[PDB]
RNA sequence: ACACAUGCUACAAUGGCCGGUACAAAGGGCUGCGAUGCCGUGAGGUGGAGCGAAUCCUUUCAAAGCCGGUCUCAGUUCGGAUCGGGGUCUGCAACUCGACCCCGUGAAGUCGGAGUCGCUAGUAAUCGCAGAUCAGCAACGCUGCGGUGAAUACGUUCCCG
């Protein structure tokens, strides 16, 4: 590592809304990150919703119900 | 901290389970990340002189390294190039910088991108290296969202000791990196 | 502030700050801000992250947004352009779909002008 | 949506067509309804006045009235 | 793919949006006009008071106006075209081709080159209302009704008849 050219590299404490907390080295001067994302990926859920999204014959039968 | 967190779990769990999955029969064949290099764009060289210092600054404070400015091998005429103009810088990460960058992006950068469905498993080379595209930026909470006029994108490469490709799929699957069949 | 995926401005009221998302206009702002309980007169600088939490969970739970409407509107237009409808023919040729005037006006579908 | 239009001549013909499990090209006058999903699979010779165009009916056709799977106007421009 | 012509909505603060409130004229009505009430968010649904109508219905009729709050000059709380979903009504039937309502969507457009048009007082300008045709409506049209309401005319040299 060279001395003076690299930015300061500090410990941090990352917190999400649910409180699931992370401790890392980072570049932030604040020493913390107040984030809205945790290790709760929505791809698993988003993908399911997207899969669920198609199919309209049923919807048509809906309007008529008969 | 003796071990970075991703490496805290890598030094026991992913290695023991990857031996479970693949019977190499020899310890120290088991595959691990070598370097994580980050691939600075631009292409505005010749067209605009000022921005590349925007990219030097950009690579820095996403991770704390001074990106080394990488320039043109040759002047190729159509896309205005000139031998020796700066066209994007890159930063090579290895060790504590590699792992702290990885865990942070993993638990920070990947979830935020709008409509971020996943990452393709297909994007390996012949030998177990994974590269994917960050089109805009401001996936990172390191960059203040009003400091940032135009979006500078980048490539991020994970380079492993994976002699195959499903080796690297298996590592980067067990390592907390997303994918989507 | 930050929300469902639209970067909110500096100084806007809430019934206008909600409007900058693809699924929300003025009336949905007047019904969302009545259901959740946030004052419509609140600026975006004065917005609370817990208000982002309750508001965000409400409007991703009981209403659809950016990716759902762009993929849904796109998937329905390409739905009627695959099956061979006459409105499919209008979306093919780049013509107005509602059967309206094509002789003089409907320039917003043909677009910029070439003159022969 | 009290009751959607049904094309009673085509309705009588369609029922006969699907009771016998027989599929036949149909020269049909009717431009007005694809009423039930009972019309799925039957080939309709739609009549724009001048000739009959064969149209296969699949599951996505439900809710589109029958005539304009066949267009009535022709335009090229040059 | 176009080019012309008459109109309408605009490009915002003399403005937009929410709340409260005051004032018209004329008209229209039988298999028509249809109230209170109830169901809807709203087109409307259910119901039929009462009227061939200075009486009943079109609500006691308006909108611009006034009082108040908010918006702070921005492609915006301007602008509504377009497009998606969801409806209602009329009709045997709303695909080619109806109007209206709800949710979303949110484009051009920053007062407009050469030119050119209208208008001399309740006029111009702007604001709603009714009618005929009509089951429904392409009505922003046409014919009328009223509301608020200006500037300028030195004068025949010039253009037009």
Swiss-Prot record, chain A:
Cofactor(s) for this UniProt protein: Zn(2+)
SUPFAM superfamilies, alphabetized: L28p-like (SSF143800)
Keyword line: Metal-binding, Ribonucleoprotein, Ribosomal protein, RNA-binding, rRNA-binding, Zinc
Cofactor binding mode and count: Binds 1 zinc ion per subunit.
Cellular component terms (Gene Ontology): ribonucleoprotein complex; ribosome
rRNA-binding in keyword set: yes
Any one Gene Ontology molecular-function term assigned to this protein's record: metal ion binding
Superkingdom classification of source: Bacteria
GO biological process terms held by the UniProt record: translation
Residues binding Zn(2+), per UniProt: 16, 18, 38, 41
Pfam families the record matches: Ribosomal_L31
Xref: InterPro entries: Ribosomal_bL28/bL31-like_sf, Ribosomal_bL31, Ribosomal_bL31_A, Ribosomal_bL31_sf
Quaternary data: Part of the 50S ribosomal subunit.
Similarity comment text for this entry: Belongs to the bacterial ribosomal protein bL31 family. Type A subfamily.
Function of the molecule: Binds the 23S rRNA.
HAMAP family, sorted: Ribosomal_bL31_1
NCBIfam families (UniProt xref): L31, PRK00019.1, PRK00528.1
Record protein name field: Large ribosomal subunit protein bL31
Organism name: Mycolicibacterium smegmatis (strain ATCC 700084 / mc(2)155)
UniProtKB/Swiss-Prot annotation, chain B:
Purpose: This is one of the proteins that bind and probably mediate the attachment of the 5S RNA into the large ribosomal subunit, where it forms part of the central protuberance. In the 70S ribosome it contacts protein S13 of the 30S subunit (bridge B1b), connecting the 2 subunits; this bridge is implicated in subunit movement. Contacts the P site tRNA; the 5S rRNA and some of its associated proteins might help stabilize positioning of ribosome-bound tRNAs.
Gene (name only): rplE
Superkingdom as given in the UniProt entry: Bacteria
Protein family per UniProt: Belongs to the universal ribosomal protein uL5 family.
Keyword Phosphoprotein in annotation: no
Name of the featured protein: Large ribosomal subunit protein uL5
Gene3D superfamilies xrefs: 3.30.1440.10
Gene Ontology CC terms: ribonucleoprotein complex; ribosome
InterPro entries xref list: Ribosomal_uL5 (IPR002132), Ribosomal_uL5_bac-type (IPR020930), Ribosomal_uL5_C (IPR031309), Ribosomal_uL5_dom_sf (IPR022803), Ribosomal_uL5_N (IPR031310)
Gene Ontology biological process terms in this record: translation
Keyword RNA-binding: yes
Subunit structure: Part of the 50S ribosomal subunit; part of the 5S rRNA/L5/L18/L25 subcomplex. Contacts the 5S rRNA and the P site tRNA. Forms a bridge to the 30S subunit in the 70S ribosome.
GO molecular function annotation: rRNA binding; structural constituent of ribosome; tRNA binding
Organism: Mycolicibacterium smegmatis (strain ATCC 700084 / mc(2)155) (Mycobacterium smegmatis)
Keywords per UniProt: Ribonucleoprotein, Ribosomal protein, RNA-binding, rRNA-binding, tRNA-binding
From Swiss-Prot, chain C:
Gene Ontology process terms (BP): translation
Annotated region described as Disordered, given as residue ranges: 94-116
Record has Ribonucleoprotein as a keyword: yes
PROSITE patterns: RIBOSOMAL_S13_1, RIBOSOMAL_S13_2
GO cellular component: cytosol; small ribosomal subunit
Keywords: Ribonucleoprotein, Ribosomal protein, RNA-binding, rRNA-binding, tRNA-binding
Transmembrane residue ranges: none
Superkingdom per UniProt: Bacteria
InterPro entries tied to this protein: Rbsml_uS13_C, Ribosomal_uS13, Ribosomal_uS13-like_H2TH, Ribosomal_uS13_bac-type, Ribosomal_uS13_CS
Pfam families recorded: Ribosomal_S13
GO molecular function, one term: rRNA binding
Function per UniProt: Located at the top of the head of the 30S subunit, it contacts several helices of the 16S rRNA. In the 70S ribosome it contacts the 23S rRNA (bridge B1a) and protein L5 of the 50S subunit (bridge B1b), connecting the 2 subunits; these bridges are implicated in subunit movement. Contacts the tRNAs in the A and P-sites.
Family: Belongs to the universal ribosomal protein uS13 family.
Subunit structure: Part of the 30S ribosomal subunit. Forms a loose heterodimer with protein S19. Forms two bridges to the 50S subunit in the 70S ribosome.
Full protein name: Small ribosomal subunit protein uS13
From Swiss-Prot, chain D:
GO molecular function: rRNA binding; structural constituent of ribosome
Keyword Iron included in the entry's annotation: no
Keywords associated with the record: Ribonucleoprotein, Ribosomal protein, RNA-binding, rRNA-binding
Domain of life of the organism encoding this protein: Bacteria
Entry's Gene Ontology cellular component terms: cytoplasm; small ribosomal subunit
BP terms from Gene Ontology: ribosomal small subunit assembly; translation
Record's function text: Protein S19 forms a complex with S13 that binds strongly to the 16S ribosomal RNA.
Family from the record: Belongs to the universal ribosomal protein uS19 family.
Protein name per Swiss-Prot or TrEMBL: Small ribosomal subunit protein uS19
Gene source species: Mycolicibacterium smegmatis (strain ATCC 700084 / mc(2)155)
Covered residues, full protein: 6 to 83 of 93
